[PDB]
Amino acid sequence: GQKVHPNGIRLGIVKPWNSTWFANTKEFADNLDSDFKVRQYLTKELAKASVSRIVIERPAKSIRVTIHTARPGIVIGKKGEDVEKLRKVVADIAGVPAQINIAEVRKPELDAKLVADSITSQLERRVMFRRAMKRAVQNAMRLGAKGIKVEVSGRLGGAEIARTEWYREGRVPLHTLRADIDYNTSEAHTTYGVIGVKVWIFKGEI
Amino acid sequence: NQYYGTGRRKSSAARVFIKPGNGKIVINQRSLEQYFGRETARMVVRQPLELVDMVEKLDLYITVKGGGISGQAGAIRHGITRALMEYDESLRSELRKAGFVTRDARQVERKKVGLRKARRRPQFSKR
Amino acid sequence: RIRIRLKAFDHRLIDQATAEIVETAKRTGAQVRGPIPLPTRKERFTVLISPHVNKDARDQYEIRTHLRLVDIVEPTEKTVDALMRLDLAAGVDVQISL
Amino acid sequence: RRRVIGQRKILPDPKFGSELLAKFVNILMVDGKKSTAESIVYSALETLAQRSGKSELEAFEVALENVRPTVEVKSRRVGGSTYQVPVEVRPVRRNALAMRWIVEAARKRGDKSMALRLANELSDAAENKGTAVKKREDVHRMAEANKAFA
Amino acid sequence: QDGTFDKLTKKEALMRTRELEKLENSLGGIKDMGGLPDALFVIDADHEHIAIKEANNLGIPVFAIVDTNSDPDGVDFVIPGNDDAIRAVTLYLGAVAATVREGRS
Amino acid sequence: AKQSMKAREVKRVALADKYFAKRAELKAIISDVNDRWNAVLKLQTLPRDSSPSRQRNRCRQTGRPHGFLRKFGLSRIKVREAAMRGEIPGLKKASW
RNA sequence: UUUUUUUUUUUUUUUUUUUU
RNA sequence: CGAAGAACCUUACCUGGUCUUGACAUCCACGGAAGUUUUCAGAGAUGAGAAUGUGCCUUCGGGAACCGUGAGACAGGUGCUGCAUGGCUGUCGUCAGCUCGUGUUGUGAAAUGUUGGGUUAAGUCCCGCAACGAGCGCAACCCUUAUCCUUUGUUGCCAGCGGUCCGGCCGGGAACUCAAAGGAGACUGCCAGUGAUAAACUGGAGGAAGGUGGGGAUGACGUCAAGUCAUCAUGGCCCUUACGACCAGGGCUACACACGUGCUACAAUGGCGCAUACAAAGAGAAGCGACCUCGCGAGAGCAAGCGGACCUCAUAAAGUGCGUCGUAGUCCGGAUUGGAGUCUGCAACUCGACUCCAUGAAGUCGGAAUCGCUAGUAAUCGUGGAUCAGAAUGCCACGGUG
């Protein structure tokens, strides 16, 4: 009956930031404003292998962009011509340069997010994804974790249908600010209305 | 050589020294009876020194920064308790046996939401 | 009595900075003051970082924000000059202004 | 309620060493202001003394003898209906109750100033004539009598 | 087996010295249990109670010294005798305890 | 009255010196009760629209005037974010 | 196993679909 | 009430004057340098004129600051349902919580440890009982104390002397308040009584608290099918010639009725007239302002200062010493009404808010029966703040004779 972030409340304790930067008194507004826009652009570039962690550092307002994706080799490009492009279009909004750094998602099966991006991809096939939903969780759980609970709310049937389903492939200590746990999301549609999946990945105890 | 004390009661904000002999009680530049002349509380400020024969052996000098005579009458009590505590270890027993050693710290588990007393827990003879 | 009102976010940084003056601005003139504090802002800090609208994720921090008077009894150039040469130590806000 | 923490300790009076005189004026207050009211009650013990020119403080007890009660009646319904049943007020409640009866007469009692109400009312008490004696004696005509109906 | 059980706070460690007091007195003859029992040797039927029920549910061998209140059909082995006190059990046990090691061969 | 008179204030707010408070520094001295020239004030009072000190104001961080807290530079409805980014430095557990 | 401290208080309308 | 300003006011609403891409904001099409100053009209929106101006790159290209008219796309509003849901808050709650990963007596709504003996104020603690233990409440991190410990000396701040031209004045040094950062010390500790030398409860060694020492605080599941539906955050659904946005007016208060919330007036445990002893809680450059000039005063002027003990707004009211009434509707009652004035304003008058002198409506201790308020707590005894071009008696928080 509660949804409860383990993440965000505990930045220094095994759960690092989505952004760590410093603006004084007057200079905060356009930084923050750009912090939605460069994020917007990056994820629609990355979606061909998603983005697990989207890490906006700002060493001097100018932006040390640090992007965890499953396949770097497609945003590197045929070697360097999309790394030019990105660094242009993420500096442009900010008015200041943006140093596009990659990282590789170290096996998508174990991740802070990519368990939700696997299940929400299936809703683009439009057929009965249920055949593949418990499966695609249990696969990723043979390659990592100790428990996971998964929730789907959305338009998942026909004509006027909106209902919500819940599933438990292991136990979940719900908040514990010491544990290795991750909370996260991802969002789909199916020509009728939203399908928004959420996760609690009890990876390990401490 | 000399001794000292300080207090914080209702809301004084006063000190005291002790000097070697002749038995008086001044407040910067006037005597006790001039500063407290009708305040029914005037009697206590010298009372545990007169015991131990102050007249040729101790002498007293009070100064002030929040006048406040109805609090000062006891702020001086814990103050002169301090002064004595280095002159004579023996009177720790006296000062304690007559209360002069105490200072203001106690409410009795009072009102926070509406119930008069609020620490004492729900209570029975088997339930 | 010209009051150089040294401050920092942390105790560690203002400590290093006052300790240079109480010695070096003292060299041939004043008994220069520096440890003497002000209403040091030991409060609690709350910014939202909730990844959606769900329970809390407003991670509460603590601060020092520690502040002191450096005091110089006379402007006497042949003793103070090291504090004006200390300009390079940008991280401490000095508020000399009086 | 299990703890023995109950009542008010205070210090005695500034002249003669009694909790009696302290508590007496520490009911008479009617608005707080303590110190000058303690000075008026001192003048009350002097305006008593003008009746003889001796130690009339020796007669403050003698008067209060006719005004200390035994009984009080409290809220009691324990046999399906009003059933009093006085029971005694304790040894320390004896003259503390008498102050209330002296004060509740004094408030309006008509004499020449604030001291001369309490001087005369404790004169009357000495002679058994007192308003405070009559306020006592009415709860003796009432409660102390229903000791034969309990 | 070392001294590290005494860490943290002495009351956080005496919380477990009470756990010792309540567990070694109740499980001290079975501190390992890496696999299930294979046979049950037993001297009561109504206090011990549960033991004969668990055994019979699982079809386990049972060796049981018993009296005139019994139900012999719930044991593989009745041994007819005085149910209680140290004199009666001690007649049987110095053979039982020998055999369960000298028969190993 | 939502975006409103902003278009009318913006064209004359910045000149409240030229309309009065520096144009006054000779002729307005005589013109006072303390100085009694009765002829004069009544022929400086004509600008009506700029006529300072008057400013309808611009609450900026709220798109419309659901009031404006002059102690704080924000709208009357706006307080709750300051527990979630610190813009009111005494916003803590309530005094009731 | 004596158990009358007054007798009464209008209809509604809550009610998160569904096979499992 | 929302409304913390229903007479420019965040506009209801009564209207009239404009509109329905409207006030605000884009992507291309052809083009423009951006603004200062009065005069007459007009209730405001808006209308009719007269003068004065011409910026930065500079590929003379493309445009910037920055203003246009013309295209196609195209703009919006507290409208409540708790019932798609998440934050958040509450009075219940400082109960020591429930129900579960497995098990299994109950098919299932029974809780299944609450059972059987005893023991504590206490699910207190010895066990037992077919019951585990799993972790989120637990174990407690906290803030302010309060007493101090070092380093300190702060506009602070003065032990003991140095000058006094009598003001910590300025020499002059480090006891302590103060200011305060790092932090620290009280435990059944040892003494008597208690009983099972359990329990814990009393007094006390010793204390700045004592058996949570106090005061703030967090406020778990469970929280009424209660909210925050008027910033929430958003799923299902609004009206759109419309619930969309520009702008001048005004009138909410009447008066029979109550009924109360909030105010008081009924005189000496009162005040009245002259004179005397001590605190501070606060807010403070859309700032706060002394000394000092003119004063019957609301209220004018001069202006040092003062950014956080320096400037200022308190010179709390009580109380105390000497005089005056003599129980007297007054000397006290501001109900109020004769005139006189003001700080702003388009604005207060059929609409206020306060001032100076004349006065003086109910007044003399009211019954029944709506709950204040147990402690350092309600009589009693004050000062501040925001909304906001602004007058709340609302409320809001700590001091103190008591």
Amino acid at B63: T
Specify whether the CB–CB gap between B11 and B73 falls below 8 A.
Answer: no
Q: What is the spatial distance between Cα A5 and Cα B7, in angstroms, rounded to a whole number? A: 52
Residue A64 exposure: Cα atoms within 13 Å on the Cβ side: 9
Residue D2's CB: how many other CB atoms inside 10 A?
Answer: 6
Spatial CB neighbours of F84, under 8 Å, sequence gap ≥ 6: C46, C47, C48, C58
Q: What is the spatial distance between Cα A111 and Cα A186, in angstroms, rounded to a whole number? A: 13
Q: How far apart are the first and last CA of chain A?
A: 25
Q: What is the spatial distance between Cα C20 and Cα C23, in angstroms, rounded to a whole number? A: 6
* Nucleotides, chain H, CB distance < 7 Å: 5, 9-11, 23-24, 36-38, 45, 77-78, 84-88, 90, 94-96, 101, 120-123, 129-130, 134-137, 139-140, 143-144, 146-148, 151-155, 157-160, 175-182, 201-210, 212-219, 221-222, 231-233, 235-236, 245-247, 268-270, 277-280, 284, 286, 300-301, 308-309, 318-321, 346, 374-377, 379-380, 385-389, 396-402
- Pick from F85, F87, F91 the residue to mutate for testing the C interface (most C CBs within 10 Å): F85
Asked if residue A193 belongs to a domain, the reply is: yes
β-partners of residue C62 are C44
Q: Which among D139, D137, D110 is positioned nearest to D125, based on CA atoms?
A: D137
* Residue F56 backbone dihedrals phi, psi, to 5 degrees: -65, -25
Specify whether the CB–CB gap between D94 and D19 falls below 8 A.
Answer: no
- Give the structural domain span for D38: 19-146
Residues 61-90 of C with CB under 7 A from strand H: 62, 64, 66, 69, 71
Rg (CA), chain B: 19
Q: What is the spatial distance between Cα D29 and Cα D35, in angstroms, rounded to a whole number? A: 10
Q: Which among B77, B121, B125 is positioned nearest to B103, based on CA atoms?
A: B77
Residues A44 and A139 both lie in one domain? no
Q: Is B39 on the interface with D (CB under 8 A)?
A: yes
Q: At what angle do helices D93-106 and D19-28 cross, to 10 degrees?
A: 40
Three-state secondary structure call for residue C40? coil
Smallest Cβ–Cβ distance between D14 and the set B43, B120, B123 belongs to B43
Residue identified by tokens 């006037």 is B30
**Burial class of E24 by CB neighbour count within 10 A (0 to 12, 13 to 18, 19+):** exposed
| Interior/surface letters B56-86, b for 16+ CB within 10 angstroms, e for the rest | eebbbebebeeebbebbbbbbbbbbbebbee
Using CA atoms, how far residue E81 sits from E61, E90, E95, E97, E100, in Å, is 19, 12, 16, 19, 22
**Burial class of A12 by CB neighbour count within 10 A (0 to 12, 13 to 18, 19+):** exposed
Instruction: Give all strands of the β-sheet with A53-60 in edge-to-edge order.
Output: A19-20, A53-60, A62-69, A101-104
Verify if strand H has an atom below 7 Å from the CB of F27: no
Residues A86 and A139 both lie in one domain? no
Q: At what angle do helices D93-106 and D114-126 cross, to 10 degrees?
A: 120
Using CA atoms, how far residue D21 sits from C68, D124, E7, E54, F1, in Å, is 56, 18, 63, 83, 74
Specify whether the CB–CB gap between A50 and A73 falls below 8 A.
Answer: no
Instruction: Indicate which CATH number applies to the domain containing D128.
Output: 1.10.455.10
β-partners of residue C93 are C7
Residue A30's CB: how many other CB atoms inside 10 A?
Answer: 14
Spatial CB neighbours of D18, under 8 Å, sequence gap ≥ 6: D12
Residues A18, C49: C-beta atoms closer than 8 Å? yes
- Residue in A closest to C60 by C-alpha: A9
- Distance of alpha carbon D131 from the chain centroid: 11
Q: How far is the CA of D45 from the C1' of H327 (A)?
A: 27
Using CA atoms, how far residue A153 sits from A4, A150, C97, D90, in Å, is 17, 10, 61, 74
Q: What is the spatial distance between Cα D13 and Cα E50, in angstroms, rounded to a whole number? A: 78
Three-state secondary structure call for residue E48? coil
Spatial CB neighbours of B23, under 8 Å, sequence gap ≥ 6: B54, B55, B56, B57, B58, B59
Using CA atoms, how far residue A47 sits from A19, A67, A103, D88, D131, in Å, is 20, 12, 15, 90, 98
Q: What is the spatial distance between Cα D103 and Cα F15, in angstroms, rounded to a whole number? A: 75
Specify whether the CB–CB gap between F30 and F40 falls below 8 A.
Answer: yes
Specify whether the CB–CB gap between A172 and A202 falls below 8 A.
Answer: yes
> C48 contacts in F (CB within 8 Å)?
84-85
Element (H, E) at C44: strand C44-45
Structural domain count, chain A: 2
- Give the structural domain span for A34: 16-106
Region for residue E59 given its phi and psi (left: phi exceeds 0; alpha: psi -120 to 50; beta: otherwise)? left
Instruction: Give all strands of the β-sheet with E40-42 in edge-to-edge order.
Output: E40-42, E62-66, E77-80
Residue D40's CB: how many other CB atoms inside 10 A?
Answer: 15
| Interior/surface letters B31-45, b for 16+ CB within 10 angstroms, e for the rest | ebeebbeeebbbeeb
- Distance of alpha carbon C42 from the chain centroid: 14
Region for residue D45 given its phi and psi (left: phi exceeds 0; alpha: psi -120 to 50; beta: otherwise)? alpha
Spatial CB neighbours of D139, under 8 Å, sequence gap ≥ 6: D69, D71, D72, D73
Q: What is the spatial distance between Cα A201 and Cα A191, in angstroms, rounded to a whole number? A: 29
Q: What is the spatial distance between Cα D106 and Cα D102, in angstroms, rounded to a whole number? A: 6
| Interior/surface letters A54-89, b for 16+ CB within 10 angstroms, e for the rest | bbbebeebebbbebbbbeeeebeeeeeeeeeebbeb
* Nucleotides, chain G, CB distance < 7 Å: 5, 17-18
Protein residues closer than 7 Å by CB to strand G: A 160-163; D 77, 80
Residue D129 exposure: Cα atoms within 13 Å on the Cβ side: 7
Residues A102 and A196 both lie in one domain? no
Asked if residue A71 belongs to a domain, the reply is: yes
Residue C69, both tokens? 């008077």
Specify whether the CB–CB gap between F25 and F44 falls below 8 A.
Answer: no
- Residue in A closest to C58 by C-alpha: A9
* Residue D143 backbone dihedrals phi, psi, to 5 degrees: -70, -55
- Distance of alpha carbon D104 from the chain centroid: 9
Q: What is the spatial distance between Cα A144 and Cα C4, in angstroms, rounded to a whole number? A: 59
Q: What is the spatial distance between Cα C32 and Cα C52, in angstroms, rounded to a whole number? A: 54
Verify if strand H has an atom below 7 Å from the CB of A147: no
Three-state secondary structure call for residue D105? helix
Do C and F make contact, counting contact as 3+ CB pairs within 8 angstroms?
A: yes
- What are the residue boundaries of the structural domains of chain B, listed by start? 1-127
Q: Is F93 on the interface with C (CB under 8 A)?
A: no
Residue A36's CB: how many other CB atoms inside 10 A?
Answer: 10
CA angle D100, D105, D110 (to 5 degrees): 150
Smallest Cβ–Cβ distance between B39 and the set D1, D3, D35 belongs to D35
Q: Which among A128, A197, A196 is positioned nearest to A158, based on CA atoms?
A: A128
- Report DSSP letters for A168-196, one per residue: ESS----S-TTS--EEEEEEEE-SSSEEE
Structural domain count, chain D: 1
Q: Is C48 on the interface with F (CB under 8 A)?
A: yes
Asked if residue A171 belongs to a domain, the reply is: yes
Q: Shortest Cα distance from D14 to chain B (angstroms)?
A: 6
Spatial CB neighbours of C83, under 8 Å, sequence gap ≥ 6: C4, C20, C21, C24, C25, C70
Asked if residue D2 belongs to a domain, the reply is: no
Using CA atoms, how far residue D67 sits from D25, D33, D58, D103, D133, in Å, is 16, 26, 16, 12, 5
Asked if residue D12 belongs to a domain, the reply is: no
Three-state secondary structure call for residue A38? helix
Three-state secondary structure call for residue B98? coil
Q: What is the spatial distance between Cα E29 and Cα A173, in angstroms, rounded to a whole number? A: 34
Three-state secondary structure call for residue E44? coil
Verify if strand H has an atom below 7 Å from the CB of A88: no
Q: What is Dmax (Cα atoms) for chain F?
A: 60
Residue C76's CB: how many other CB atoms inside 10 A?
Answer: 14
- Pick from A2, A3, A4, A5 the residue to mutate for testing the C interface (most C CBs within 10 Å): A5
β-partners of residue C68 are C37
Specify whether the CB–CB gap between B20 and B29 falls below 8 A.
Answer: no
Residue B54's CB: how many other CB atoms inside 10 A?
Answer: 19
Q: Which among B43, B47, B60 is positioned nearest to B98, based on CA atoms?
A: B47
Using CA atoms, how far residue B100 sits from B21, B61, B78, in Å, is 22, 19, 7
Q: Which among D26, D45, D33 is positioned nearest to D96, based on CA atoms?
A: D26
Q: What is the spatial distance between Cα F44 and Cα F29, in angstroms, rounded to a whole number? A: 13
Q: What is the spatial distance between Cα D88 and Cα D140, in angstroms, rounded to a whole number? A: 12
- Report DSSP letters for A94-144, one per residue: HTS----EEEE-S-GGG-SSHHHHHHHHGGGS-S-THHHHHHHHHHHHHSS
Q: What is the spatial distance between Cα A96 and Cα A91, in angstroms, rounded to a whole number? A: 5
- Pick from B40, B45, B69, B72 the residue to mutate for testing the D interface (most D CBs within 10 Å): B40
Specify whether the CB–CB gap between E42 and E52 falls below 8 A.
Answer: yes
Q: What is the spatial distance between Cα E39 and Cα E54, in angstroms, rounded to a whole number? A: 12
> D3 contacts in B (CB within 8 Å)?
120
Spatial CB neighbours of B48, under 8 Å, sequence gap ≥ 6: B80, B81, B84, B91, B94, B95, B98, B100
Residues D35, B123: C-beta atoms closer than 8 Å? no
**Burial class of A42 by CB neighbour count within 10 A (0 to 12, 13 to 18, 19+):** buried
Asked if residue A8 belongs to a domain, the reply is: no
Spatial CB neighbours of B29, under 8 Å, sequence gap ≥ 6: none
Q: What is the spatial distance between Cα D14 and Cα D22, in angstroms, rounded to a whole number? A: 8
Q: What is the spatial distance between Cα C70 and Cα C83, in angstroms, rounded to a whole number? A: 10
Residues A115 and A155 both lie in one domain? yes
Spatial CB neighbours of D68, under 8 Å, sequence gap ≥ 6: D94, D95, D97, D98, D136
Using CA atoms, how far residue D122 sits from D22, D97, D116, in Å, is 16, 15, 10
**Burial class of C3 by CB neighbour count within 10 A (0 to 12, 13 to 18, 19+):** middle
Q: Is A2 on the interface with C (CB under 8 A)?
A: yes
CA angle B95, B101, B102 (to 5 degrees): 145
Domains of chain C: 1-98 (3.30.70.600)
> C47 contacts in F (CB within 8 Å)?
84-86
Spatial CB neighbours of A59, under 8 Å, sequence gap ≥ 6: A99
Residue E18, both tokens? 């009470």
| Interior/surface letters A173-183, b for 16+ CB within 10 angstroms, e for the rest | ebbeeebbbbb
How was this entry determined? cryo-EM
Q: What is the spatial distance between Cα F54 and Cα F75, in angstroms, rounded to a whole number? A: 19
Q: Name the domain boundary from A106, A131, A159.
A: A106
Q: What is the spatial distance between Cα C33 and Cα D136, in angstroms, rounded to a whole number? A: 74
**Burial class of E53 by CB neighbour count within 10 A (0 to 12, 13 to 18, 19+):** exposed
Q: How far apart are the first and last CA of chain F?
A: 36
